[PDB]
Amino acid sequence: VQAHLFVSLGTAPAIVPEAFLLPGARFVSVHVLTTERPDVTLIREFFRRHAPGVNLTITRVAGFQDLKSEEDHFRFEEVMFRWFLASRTGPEQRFVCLTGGFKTMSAAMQKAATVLGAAEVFHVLADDCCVGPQGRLMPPSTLEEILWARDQGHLHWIRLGPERGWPQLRRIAPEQFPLQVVEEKGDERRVQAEDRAFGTFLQDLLQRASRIAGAWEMLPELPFADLATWSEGELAWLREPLDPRAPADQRWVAGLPKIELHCHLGGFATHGELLRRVRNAAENPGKLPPLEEPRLPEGWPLPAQPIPLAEYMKLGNANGTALLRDPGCLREQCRLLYRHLVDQGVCYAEVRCSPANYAEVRSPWDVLADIRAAFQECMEGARTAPGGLPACHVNLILIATRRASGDYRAAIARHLALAVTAAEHWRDENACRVVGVDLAGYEDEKTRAHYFREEFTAVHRCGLAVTVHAGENDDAEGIWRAVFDLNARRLGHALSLGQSRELLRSVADRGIGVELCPYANLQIKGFRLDGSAPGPYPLLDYLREGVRVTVNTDNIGISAASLTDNLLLAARLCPGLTRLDLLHLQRHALETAFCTATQRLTLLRRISSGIPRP
Amino acid sequence: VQAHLFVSLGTAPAIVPEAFLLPGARFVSVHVLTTERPDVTLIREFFRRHAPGVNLTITRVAGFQDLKSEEDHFRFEEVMFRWFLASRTGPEQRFVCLTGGFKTMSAAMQKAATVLGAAEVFHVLADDCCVGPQGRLMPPSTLEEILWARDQGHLHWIRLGPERGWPQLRRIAPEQFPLQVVEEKGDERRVQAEDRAFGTFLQDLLQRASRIAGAWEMLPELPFADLATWSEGELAWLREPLDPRAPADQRWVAGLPKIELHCHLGGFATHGELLRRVRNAAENPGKLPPLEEPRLPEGWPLPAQPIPLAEYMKLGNANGTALLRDPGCLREQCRLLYRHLVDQGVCYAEVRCSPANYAEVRSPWDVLADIRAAFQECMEGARTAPGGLPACHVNLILIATRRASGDYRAAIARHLALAVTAAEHWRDENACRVVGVDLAGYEDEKTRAHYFREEFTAVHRCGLAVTVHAGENDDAEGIWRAVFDLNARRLGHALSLGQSRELLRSVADRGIGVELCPYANLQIKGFRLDGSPGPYPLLDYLREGVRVTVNTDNIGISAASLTDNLLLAARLCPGLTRLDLLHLQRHALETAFCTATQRLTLLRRISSGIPRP
Helix, strand or coil, X not given: CXXXXXXXXXXXXXXXXXXXXXXXXXXXXXEEEECCCCCCHXXXXXXXXXXXXXXXXXXXXXXXXXXXXXXXXXXXXXXXXXXXXXXXXXXXXXXXXXXXXXXXXXXXXXXXXHHCCCCEEEEECCCCCCCCCCCCCCCCCCXXXXXXXXXXXXXXXXXXXXXXXXXXXXXXXXXXXXXXXXXXXXXXXXXXXXXXXXXXXXXXXXXXXXXXXXXXXXXXXXXXXXXXXXXXXHHHHCCCECCCCCCCHHHHHCXXXXXXXXXXXXXXXXXXXXXXXXXXXXXXXXXXXXXXXXXXXXXXXXXCCCCCHHXXXXXXXXXXXXXXXXXXXXXXXXXXXXXXXXXXXXXXXXXXXXXXXXXXXXXXHHHHHHHHHHHHHHHHHHCCCCCCCCCCEEEEEECCCCCCCCCHHHHHHHHHHHHHHHHHHCXXXXXXXXXXXXXXXXXXXXXXXXXXXXXXXXXXXXXXXXXXXXXXXXXXXXXXXXXXXXCCCEEEEXXXXXXXXXXXXXXXXXXXXXXXXXXXXXXXXXXXXXXXXXXXXXXXXXXXXXCEEEECCECHHHHCCCHHHHHHHHHHHCCCCEHHHHHHHHHHHHHCCCCCHHHHXXXXXXXXXXXXXX | CCCEEECCCCCCCXXXXXXXXXXXXXXXXXXXXXXXXXXXXXHHHHHHHCCCCCEEEEEEECCCCCCCCHHHHHHHHHHHHHHHHHHCCCCCCCEEECCCCCHHHHHHHHHHHHHHCCCCEEEEEECCCCECHHHCECCCCCCHHHHHHHHHCCEEEEEEECCCCCHHHHCCCCCCCCCEEEECCCCEEEEECCCXXXXXXXXXXXXXXXXXXXXXXXXXXXXXXHHHHCCHHHHHHHCCECCCCCCCXXXXXXXXXXXXXXXXXXXXXXXXXXXXXXHCCCCCHHHCCCCCCCCCCCCCCCCCCCCCHHHHHHHCCCCCCCCCCCHHHHHHHHHHHHHHHHHHCECEEEEEECCCCCCCCCCHHHHHHHHHHHHHHHHHHHCCCCCCCCCCEEEEEEECCCCCXXXXXXXXXXXXXXXXXXXXXXXXXXCCCEEEEECCCCCCHHHHCCCCCCCCCHHHHHCCXXXXXXXXXXXXXXXXXXXXXXXXCEEEECCCCCCCHHHHHHHHHHCCEEEECHHHHHHHHCCCXXXXXXXXXXXXXXXXXXXXEECCECHHHHCCCHHHHHHHHHHHCCCCECXXXXXXXXXXXXXXXXXXXHHHHHHHHHHCCCCCC
């Protein structure tokens, strides 16, 4: 109910104290400007009296004596707009006055109230109030006739209708439209304006709504609907090549809301302090394995030579099946992963795990229950304020197991049966829930999974999604079979699709998604970096054809990189990538998720109103 | 370009003479509203002081001497408001100026300018203008110091800009909002009012718009990005129920760009003049069957009782197989269909046809070639100016045949072979081309054919989409089998999906489109109209996230177009808003069978064509 007051002052200073008087409407603050000519001494005396606690921010122009030239008009409008900007208050809290002014045209304030939302407009009136010595309604000597008129009420205040403001400018910040203070003498200040950028922005917003000449190419092909309210200069910044080494471009990617779809729980904390923290919350300290940390190759984030997959897997042999057989370690790892995900700014994640691996005495169901309980407790604990919803939704995807010595059919059957029952058990739509399964594996699984299509027909009826990790070999026939027989909806990696036009066109048309991990691909398969045997990274081509490409993290601990670093490295690998392409990537990732329609709408609202302005 | 102008009021007369001075702006009319006091003698001086000629209706209130009371503001607001109403001039012809008067009526009149709408707001300001005694900047004697100032350029008119006004209040008449003329003293005029109903209307409209516009979720979730630059009133209008009988919404629906996905070539011109036009272009007039138009049921567009499907089919027995076995008739039908589609405003269509039906002596390939050649000739003919592209794009879908007399498996094989060969033959991406097949009649029904899955693995590799028609019964098993074995991407009709949550959820998630035809569905299955067979399952599908479309099916048999189908869909499901139409268009665009470049071009064309109210 903080009613910050915005009153203009003319050559008559009675309007300030009088419009201060209002039915109720206790004012936390009062903001006024004038020109250099009028004095402030009697306003000083007035404010020293019964209202000393409130502040009186009286700002002044750099130079002004009258408003008769047009230049005076644009300058006054600009300075007044930057006033209202610098006030830093909610639209429902701003109040507008009689706007008398020293013939300040009295209309700029109404224009501001119309374009920028406010709460109310009132009009002071003088009726037999403060009858002066001359007989006319002169303002009091200092304040005595104010009290006199308040005693016998005829003056009053004529109140107009409230305004809401234009939808586009209703949300805005003073940082992109600042002002320079010439000098501040106590509560009084003198400021000045630089350029009519705000007027240019308003004129652009008016003009693009009429013609379609220049906006016709730009607006219709924009990823999010909230990007149509940006200025012409900002939209030009968005259509320029992204520099991954600029100290300013790095802080923009760090504030974007992000969606994550390829993460592994068993490869998070494998080195450094986090390993110590995980190895501290163990329930049974007596059976923890000896602390050995594998040695990373030279310049590990950017190795000079590709390493094979087996060495990559063994690089994380300090936190996995060895450590996650103790419940405390499992819970602590879940909590740390959630905290890191929240810090990165992710708003929706899908963690992949295989409960069978971390089970030697307990059953897989107990491991799944513990994981779900930990994640749900964290989600309920966080509960930030997008409307009461948790800060980061987390779902679950069940990948197959590793110890494939027992009967393969038995392992597959157990893996799918655990998923179906878990899907049936947790049916609430605001909590962790198993959403899909993974069919990673070929050769033996190629001979088993693809042939036994009838095995994977129950899952389809139970409401679960299927993702296939097309890793090594990456032949075309496997992709054809995965797309058309297994009815998968997302593909893993699959970096070679441009060697068969029919497959690329089919994948583009049907809508299947593709998941790419820059750091892992560079460190495992090898790729050229910067401007200068594998070919170019197939990200720009996929984005141009119309495929739904995403960028993910894969293994956070083994690769030692986060989502932001992955995006910047993706910018490095393909020269020419623009920021609009990053927003396209986010939109595609949102589209290809496994959530429900209500969650999709909520995520769209959250993302579209979070993009930081340049 | 007639300029009906509103000047101002003023205690000092000078406001009117200095406001009539505008650079390069001729006004055919001048209207003034003011109080009892002002010296009407000086406006009488101005009456012929200017010279050339303009109306000078001076309106007066029944009683007023000062703006000092709270009710005074409301009284003058209503009076001047109804003065605007009774003006009877176009929104783009009004001219508005608040140079003079007191403060409150200036604020009220600028508020009228923004809310009601205007074309330009200007301020007259004097700089060293008309110097008088003691060096006082003060109005001229009669007009001569104005002449001196014009000789010296001492006048500065400050122009602000145009206005838009709220959509509902843009069009209004004074008959329902009259006034009370006290006395029109020739050019002078006196008025009074009766109530403040129009101000109550404005308050109710604004408060209802505010209440409807809650959290600003509207901006993040608009269908098309171009709508994000609209004014608040237009969005509020878009968030209201659609009235299908008003003479204003119908033109808006007519103006909308549209996409058609369910049309039949063999049921276009089956009655009236079009039948005669088609029959007059036959190559061999001696072999034409005698003209016999079937008789339509009672009130055919909206029958009072459903009819069986067989009678619906027999209705179109004048332009079926009988007439189309002649090249001239085929060409004329194709050309007429293209012209009608262009007139309706369609920008992308997919016409279904069965070439085998119209082949007796000629082979099916000749029929297909003739159809493609006719459509391509028309397409290259139109090419108006989208970006240099044709005004309408037409692709083809091959449905199965009707004559299940011979070996049906042979018919299916020939159908698919023709489809594949035609798909490979024409490969340019800016011309008519076979884009998909329709495994209609459930292939040949599960009675004799079920689903030869291993047969339909070649069309997928050759790049053809599959559409499955849901006809009678519509058991969930059939839809399950179609979706997860035939890899279909669109479903026909399928009005019963709400009876199984799992099917609805799966269909919504995967992204399979649904095609609905309101007129045909009403005439064949029976439905309740104007809220009086269950309710029409269109609003439920939209609220559940399914991708729904509205089509025409048969144009000649049903005797309706896309616009009429949209309006009837509005009638069937009460509460449908004007945003749902754009949602349907977006879904139709997303479910089409075109290519990525065509999809981007279609998005650009649709998003830049939506008409503002």
